Write a protein that binds this ligand. Structure first.
Ligand code: CA
Ligand code: FE2
Lengths: 510, 72, 386, 168, 388
């Protein structure tokens, strides 16, 4: 009678037999694919063991946070720009984590093999962990940081701005709306393997560089869970590799997923990294090229080639429209700064030198513009100026891609300057590329997202901000700011005085 | 009534003083000029389980800070 | 290097100095409470609420939503990412629910982890203490290996019944509870297998293979109607609330509670089996934990909704009647297992009484909440027909 | 009264729905509303910013009315219009399988939603429909997805090209 | 102030710069292994060993010590702070012992903490699940409240028997194990009271007062010899090893194991009591945990000592015979409790068999290790004489 027990893998050995056959034992969701009901999972886990390995990670994370990091005042000694950037990075990731919960719940329903279901299930739970983790970052920075506003209510104040819309595309709807397999590609095969995993590490790098030790503590912990999300995204391709329908649909859903994801992150991440920081880590162009071409588009998809998977056809396009995308976007984000839930800052000289050094030609375009805006007084509340006005004055209309929700200014952009406008059954639609346009043409009922110009049309700026709670606790000062300094913060009144009224830029083609 | 109930450390501690009983050789094994009143009370109503819990909670943080953020 | 090449803004003199110089004198807002705008269920906002409520990006057209506009991408056909169309139940606010145990991820895994580590210690103490000796051989190789074992498929099935709710739940709070309710079920199913695997190690000749208990589940008579009910709750229900509600406030509250508590928990001891009861203690803790959440969502929030109280109760009564029948059938078939027990193990009076306990508790904690008129004698007599 | 979450438009419909005290009136209005304001085929985009919210408030009324009017079996198996849910499902699924192309398929699917979305059809049958109809719609659509060039595709969709711009 | 007045050398630019400038290029020694000089029990030195072995400042004149010289301050009379004179056992090295579970403080409290929190959850689920309903009233108000309750004083007494060893143990490893063995005993005693307190809350009329079980212990017949043995192990033994050894490798291995496992664990179920068995599961886990340590110290280290194997076994056999008698007497008196059980609850054959299990396990795990010649039939027959 020696001391003995049973471990998770010893029980997992029989987990595949848990599922039994019967008439209606099939997916409740539409899908062109057929997941082999004998598919196996990479990690032999059971609920008990899963909980233990995750709780152990929590111990450390929260230990560092409630103890040493708080004693060191890590919540304050962060660069102002980065404190703001984390309001977006963490809350936006939070929803990607939260929709990934529903997404894998859908994949779990799709899987027919008990092991493949269990794989997705472990993620359903991981994703819940990540939702709460990202939430904690904002929670911690609210309680301990230099500026709680935005961190304390991003869940409602994010609705005011246009950047949020595109976030729900790649990390919310793109995760749960459509064919379970297509969604799986958006979430795991592309989203996580191409962007989220490398990104999570990148953020900890930029965070550390700007005095933020809070994010590395949480995100590095989230990172330890991504090995399991990868296996599921890879197991999805395997569970369908044998179905004849896969040879007919996989690459199209994959290419669409690739485009969907990069369309948003290529410009948004780069922007948050280079403009939301003081200290730089590495040029986004270099970063992007390694992630999308070397790591993903080459090594990751190369290993799936034996399953019929090929490099996304829109890959070359993505690369060519990438170089300036994030620079083009910041111009719009800063011009529309009053619609955010975070404070933005204009590049200081040291940074302009950095940008030009890494992006030849940066100065003559963006640099000169930012300097003009500052002379105009875009940082000072008494100027009565807001970069959006400069766009109107110089006939540079800003459009919203009907599909990706990504804001674009074709007349000013240095990157893509394509614009396709269509009218269909009484409605106008604006597209920024041939891939998103095809998506809408083929699936118009999948993309009916009202953009901000449509919703805010005829509305006065301050009223939209006030209505959506874009104010600090003093009920007067705006959450968003055109600078990250401590004084001369714009107030609702400074905005009302501008008497800025939204207009749907498309009504011009009339 | 089936309301969710339990028992806490102080509820058990209430009767801890009665745990010791009397008998001839129930006395200290060590030399001492003093006589500790055998009715003396303690300030904190703890039991082994609860003591372990409040100490383990402190450990979580301590070792968490050490193995993680402080090492980083 | 001893110092490493990477420089950190919190410790690097140069970088930190630049950082410190850019800092404001005091925080730009005194409101350091994330989730401050959330309506507290209790005196003060809890960490549980702050970290959960409103994580789901719902627009105002889904009761309680704070966002606006349609989803950015929908299903072919036009189905919304999340929508009112996925459940018959209606409410003034889907974010109203609150897990009475306030379980967000960290607390949840911490508890299951404690239970896992202790289970390991328990089994190691059980095996070394040779307690297996005093266990009845027939009860072991027959009722635990076959019948208790087959029950794991019941729990597994209830587990899978949650897959669609994890995807369709209309709010974070409800989604999280749902995920935890189902995850506890797969846990139990794996614990039943853990015991079988444990016995295989201390009892020379005990086959841990699931073949026997699976064959009992798929082709047996004892669990026939039980399996039929499980296949239905799982795959024939597309309404995430009917699924959760019917599974927890009907089938498992009756059939599950009877099998676990009134059969195995009640009889195992009589055969010198303290092992199985150890795992059932967990299953019952899990059950009582889930029940609180289930009650808050369906009774406190939905059944008592200021605007759809009447409507919702009507629907849940409909569901109760719809599933009460297959559940009674599952119990009826289960009655057959008693004839398999060594004579004298238990009599008809004990079984009736135990049935009445399960039924009265159900009427107690569920039926009465939605004014479902349940006749306890009729239900029991229908089952006893076995 | 102008607002995103609260405006005259929305108040207007609230009073309008408050005057629907008959399952038949309400059910018919909801169906009519869906034909007029939802999907790329809506009759007009005048309520683009409020229809989603209005539709829901309308469904609430139909649901409440249906629950009080229908017996238990009907609430589970009949549509608000008295149609037998399973029949409608199997019927619509039949046409979807007989669909000759993606253009016919989408018409069927989108129309199904406009007509039977809960509380018209019971959700169980509806989501069962969503599963079968959606699968066929995708199979037809994702086949040779890139073969048709944009120039032609715009013609097939029948959009009115208002402006095209392309440096490359 | 958002930043605070105190400046920290790790984050303050000025101070850190000064600190960084004074740092060497690489560590002044590559041996970053604290306790590297400790002889590993297993393949690699464990955190348990590093953090524990040699914490006790023993000089070489106490087997295994690494220091030198007398203590700085001793007792009036001259008694050393720690010395060889506090135990009859001898060894080549007191730091040889290793808790097989490698329990240092952190791991120890972490486990008991898990058990505590789960116990709380279990009771809350037990009360809400109304399981109390199916429990036999007589078994509850009589055998749990009085007899099981009285047993808490047995555990409490064994707990106190460790007080002198916590003070006299000749090494860190042995001191820590000893402390944990005794602490688990007070824990059990409090758990027995926790159950009585729990029942008081769900059973209207159950008095949680210790008066009844205490009167059963102090003046009853059932536990008379048991209490007499406990008073002796605790206060009549001044040798910390005889105390630990006799308590765990004799009295509790026989009497304790019989009461806990062969009586309450065995019969409670029969009366619809799944409550008590929950707490006994803990007590038995604790017992099996302590047993490993007790075995390593007395058999692996002492009983098998390269130089004092013979001597030590002689002494432990002496102690076994000295305490086996009072232990048999404790069991004999305990036999009286069976007559108090409702007729038909159990028969003489069941009791004999169960006695044989306890005795065979004892010979199995203890007696045989020191070559103590034990007659199982004689022991059992002596006890059975107690059956009324
Ligand atoms: Ca007999
Ligand atoms: Fe994640």
């Amino acid at each position: 009678r020696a001391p003995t027990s049973v471990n998770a893998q010893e029980v997992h050995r029989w987990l595949q037999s848990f599922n039994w056959d019967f008439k209606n034992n099939r997916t409740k969701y539409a899908t062109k694919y057929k997941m082999a009901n004998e598919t196996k999972e990479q990690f032999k886990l059971i609920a008990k063991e899963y909980a233990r390995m995750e709780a152990v990670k929590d111990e450390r994370q929260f230990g560092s946070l409630q103890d040493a990091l708080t004693r060191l005042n890590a919540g304050v000694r962060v660069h102002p720009k980065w404190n703001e950037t984390m309001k977006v990075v963490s809350n936006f990731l939070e929803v990607g984590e939260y929709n990934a919960i529903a997404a894998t719940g859908m994949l779990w329903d799709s899987a027919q093999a008990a092991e493949q279901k269990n794989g997705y299930l472990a993620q359903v739970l991981d994703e819940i962990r990540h939702t709460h983790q990202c939430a904690y970052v904002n929670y911690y920075f609210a309680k301990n940081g230099q500026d709680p506003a935005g961190h304390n209510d991003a869940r409602r104040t994010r609705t005011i701005g246009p950047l949020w819309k595109g976030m729900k595309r790649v990390f919310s709807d793109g995760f749960i709306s459509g064919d379970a397999v297509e969604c799986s590609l958006n979430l795991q095969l592309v989203g996580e393997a191409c962007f989220t995993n490398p990104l999570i590490v990148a953020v900890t790098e930029w965070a550390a560089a700007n005095g933020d030790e809070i994010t590395p503590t949480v995100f590095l912990s989230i990172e330890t869970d991504e090995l399991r999300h990868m296996a599921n995204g890879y197991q999805t391709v395997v569970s369908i590799a044998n179905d004849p329908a896969s040879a007919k649909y996989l690459n199209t859903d994959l290419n669409n997923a690739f485009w969907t994801q990069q369309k948003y992150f290529t410009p948004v991440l780069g922007m948050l990294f280079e403009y939301g920081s003081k200290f730089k880590v590495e040029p986004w162009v270099k970063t992007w090229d390694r992630w999308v071409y070397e790591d993903w588009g080459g090594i990751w998809i190369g290993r799936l080639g034996k399953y019929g998977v090929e490099s996304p056809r829109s890959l070359k396009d993505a690369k060519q429209d990438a170089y300036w995308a994030h620079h083009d976007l910041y111009l719009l984000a800063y011009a529309l700064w009053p619609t955010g839930f975070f404070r933005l800052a204009l590049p200081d000289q040291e940074e302009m030198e950095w940008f030009e050094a890494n992006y030849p030609g940066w100065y003559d375009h963006y640099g000169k513009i930012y300097e003009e805006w500052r002379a105009r007084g875009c940082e000072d509340p008494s100027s009565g100026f807001i970069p959006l006005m400069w766009f109107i004055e110089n006939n540079h209309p800003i459009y919203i891609d009907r599909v990706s929700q990504v804001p674009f200014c074709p007349s000013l952009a240095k990157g893509a300057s394509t614009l396709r406008v269509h009218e269909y059954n009484g409605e106008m639609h604006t597209f920024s590329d041939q891939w998103g346009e095809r998506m809408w043409l083929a699936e118009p009922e999948r993309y009916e997202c009202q953009n901000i110009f449509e919703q805010y049309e005829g509305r006065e700026l301050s009223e939209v901000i006030a209505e959506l709670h874009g104010l600090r606790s003093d009920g007067k000062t705006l959450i968003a700011q055109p600078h990250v300094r401590g004084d001369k913060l714009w107030t609702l009144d400074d905005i009302k005085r501008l008497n800025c009224v939204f207009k749907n830029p498309v009504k011009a083609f009339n | 009534n089936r309301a969710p109930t339990s028992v806490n450390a102080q509820e058990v501690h209430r009767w801890l003083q009665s745990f010791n009983w009397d008998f001839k050789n129930n006395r200290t094994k060590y030399a001492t000029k003093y006589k500790m009143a055998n009715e003396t009370k303690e300030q904190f109503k703890l039991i082994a389980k609860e003591y372990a819990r409040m100490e383990a909670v402190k450990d979580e943080r301590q070792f968490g800070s050490l193995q993680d953020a402080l090492t980083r | 290097s001893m110092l490493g090449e990477r420089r950190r803004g919190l410790t690097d003199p140069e970088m930190a100095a630049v950082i410190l110089k850019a800092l404001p004198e005091a925080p730009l807002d005194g409101n350091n409470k994330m989730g401050y705008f959330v309506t507290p269920r209790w005196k003060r906002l809890t960490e549980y609420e702050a970290l959960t409520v409103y994580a789901q990006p719902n627009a105002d057209w889904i009761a309680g939503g704070l966002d606006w506009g349609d989803w950015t991408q929908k299903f072919h056909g036009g189905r919304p990412s999340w929508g009112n169309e996925t459940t018959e139940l209606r409410t003034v606010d889907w974010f109203k629910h609150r897990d009475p145990l306030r379980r967000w991820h960290a607390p949840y895994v911490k508890d299951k982890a404690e239970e896992w580590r202790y289970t390991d210690r328990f089994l190691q103490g059980y095996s070394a203490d040779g307690q297996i000796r005093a266990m009845n051989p027939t009860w072991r190789d027959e009722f635990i290996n076959r019948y208790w074992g087959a029950f794991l498929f019941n729990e597994y099935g209830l587990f899978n019944a949650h897959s669609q709710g994890a995807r369709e739940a209309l709010s974070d709070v409800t989604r999280v509870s749902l995920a935890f309710w189902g995850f506890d079920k797969i846990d139990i199913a794996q614990m039943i297998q853990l015991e079988r695997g444990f016995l295989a190690k201390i009892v020379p000749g005990f086959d841990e293979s699931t073949a026997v208990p699976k064959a009992e589940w798929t082709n047996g008579e004892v669990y026939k109607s039980a399996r039929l009910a499980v296949e239905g709750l799982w795959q024939e229900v597309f309404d995430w609330n009917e699924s959760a509600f019917s599974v927890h406030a009907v089938y498992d509250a009756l059939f599950g509670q009877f099998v676990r508590r009134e059969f195995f928990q009640r009889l195992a001891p009589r055969f010198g089996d303290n092992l199985t009861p150890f795992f059932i203690n967990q299953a019952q803790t899990y059950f009582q934990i889930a029940k609180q959440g289930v009650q808050d969502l369906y009774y406190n929030c939905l059944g008592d909704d200021p605007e759809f109280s009447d409507y919702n109760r009507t629907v849940m009564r409909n569901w109760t009647g719809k599933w009460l029948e297959p559940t009674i059938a599952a119990l009826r078939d289960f009655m057959g297992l008693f004839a398999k027990l060594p004579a004298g193990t238990t009599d008809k009076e004990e079984i009736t009484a135990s049935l009445y306990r399960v039924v009265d508790d159900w009427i107690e904690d569920y039926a009465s909440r939605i004014d479902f008129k349940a006749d306890r004698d009729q239900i029991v007599k229908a089952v006893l027909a076995g | 009264k102008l607002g995103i979450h609260s405006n005259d438009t929305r108040d207007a419909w609230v009073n309008k729905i408050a005057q629907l005290n008959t399952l038949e009136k309400a059910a018919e209005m909801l169906k009519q509303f869906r034909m007029d304001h939802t999907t790329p085929f809506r009759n007009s985009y005048e309520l683009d910013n409020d229809y989603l919210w209005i539709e829901a408030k309308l469904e609430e009324k139909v649901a409440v009315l249906k629950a009080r009017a229908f017996n238990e079996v009907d609430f589970r198996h009949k549509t608000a219009f008295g149609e037998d849910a399973k029949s409608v499902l199997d019927g619509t699924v039949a046409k979807m399988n007989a669909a000759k192309d993606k253009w016919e398929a989408e018409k069927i699917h989108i129309g199904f939603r406009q007509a039977y979305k809960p509380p018209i059809m019971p959700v169980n049958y509806f989501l069962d429909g969503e599963r079968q109809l959606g699968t066929r719609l995708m199979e037809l659509r994702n086949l040779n997805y890139y073969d048709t060039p944009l120039e032609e595709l715009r013609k097939q969709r029948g959009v009115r090209v208002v402006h095209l711009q392309s440096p490359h």
